[PDB]
Structure 1
Amino acid sequence: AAAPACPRFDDPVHAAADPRVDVERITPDPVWRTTCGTLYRSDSRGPAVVFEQGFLPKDVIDGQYDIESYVLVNQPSPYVSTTYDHDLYKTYYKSGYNYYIDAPGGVDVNKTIGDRHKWADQVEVAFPGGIRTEFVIGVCPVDKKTRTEKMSECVGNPHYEPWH
């Protein structure tokens, strides 16, 4: 069978864990992701924390709202970064976990700032205000020495709420 199209929420930051994010401050003009495939995030923070809190951004108030600046220099920002690439965890050595995300929206970085910048290979989606736990599917821990997922140790998020 051929797959169906994706639901479209009216609120572009419907997914935000911190709704104080000010969408009008995002620069440059964001190109919102309209697909709904699984996204991924490398993070060293453990699933007990992420499943309780979701992914909260570092600074929705005074953080770096410019996406190009945030991608290039990684200051505290209103964004939580994710990737289209299931395998990007292989490039994140420090990071103990590959989180699986099923969330509407997000700013498509390469569509917003182009695909010629230094980190275009990361195929990132930046979530303004972060990501509520109901949109975090689960996680797989990563074996650092082989850069592989420990698949018998993946865990589903009890708070995940499928929506499509």
Structure 2
Amino acid sequence: AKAAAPACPRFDDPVHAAADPRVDVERITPDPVWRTTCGTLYRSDSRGPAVVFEQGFLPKDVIDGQYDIESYVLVNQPSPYVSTTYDHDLYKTWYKSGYNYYIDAPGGVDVNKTIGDRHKWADQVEVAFPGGIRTEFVIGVCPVDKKTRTEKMSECVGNPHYEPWH
């Protein structure tokens, strides 16, 4: 080294990653701009890793939840989406969610590419996964010390179910 990074694998299925494949891609509004990069993404969640490593990240409701992205972002009501972020540090902004999960998953809807980078929550730099995220795409987790908003890095854990794909 040094070395330039290679380009990403592209699955034909825009919801390849989905933990709940009943999600209906045609109902997504507006027209989604899918993420085509393959960097690590993150998610603050208060749910613990015993659960997330077994189940993945399941969406609250693929059947009757809020398929409109702008609505889902602005009002946060049960949806077919699991939100993640490009920003490793967004956990510092979360009220008291426990853990910073590390994700290596193809696809997702890029929220700012889809709805623009001017809405109220644009600095969350979100990627919304319709159908969620299977366990094989969850790398691991670091617990968060809440009073300093830092990761407890000697307490990070790998997901035994993680399956590297690139």
- Cα separation, 1, equivalents of 2:15 and 2:129: 8
- Cα separation, 2, equivalents of 1:49 and 1:123: 26
CA shift for structure 1 position 94:
1.1
> Quick check: 1:93–1:147 contact (8 Å CA) kept in 2?
no
Report SS of the residue matched to 1:58. Answer: coil
Q: TM-score, normalised by structure 1?
A: 1.00
Q: Moved runs in structure 1, 4+ residues, more than 4 A? A: none
> Quick check: 1:81–1:126 contact (8 Å CA) kept in 2?
yes
Q: Percent identity?
A: 99
- Cα separation, 1, equivalents of 2:123 and 2:5: 26
Q: Which residue of 2 aligns with 1:43?
A: 45
Alignment of 1:127-142 (within 5 A): 127-142=129-144
- Cα separation, 2, equivalents of 1:82 and 1:147: 18
> Quick check: 1:40–1:82 contact (8 Å CA) kept in 2?
yes
- Cα separation, 1, equivalents of 2:40 and 2:124: 15
CA shift for structure 1 position 93:
2.4
Deviation string 1:4-54 (CA, Å, 9 cap, x unpaired) is 000000000000000000000000000000000000000000000000000
- Cα separation, 1, equivalents of 2:144 and 2:29: 34
Report SS of the residue matched to 2:72. Answer: helix
CA shift for structure 1 position 110:
0.1
Please list every run of 5 or more consecutive structure 2 residues that lacks an aligned counterpart in the other structure. none
Please list every run of 5 or more consecutive structure 1 residues that lacks an aligned counterpart in the other structure. none
Q: TM-score, normalised by structure 2?
A: 0.99
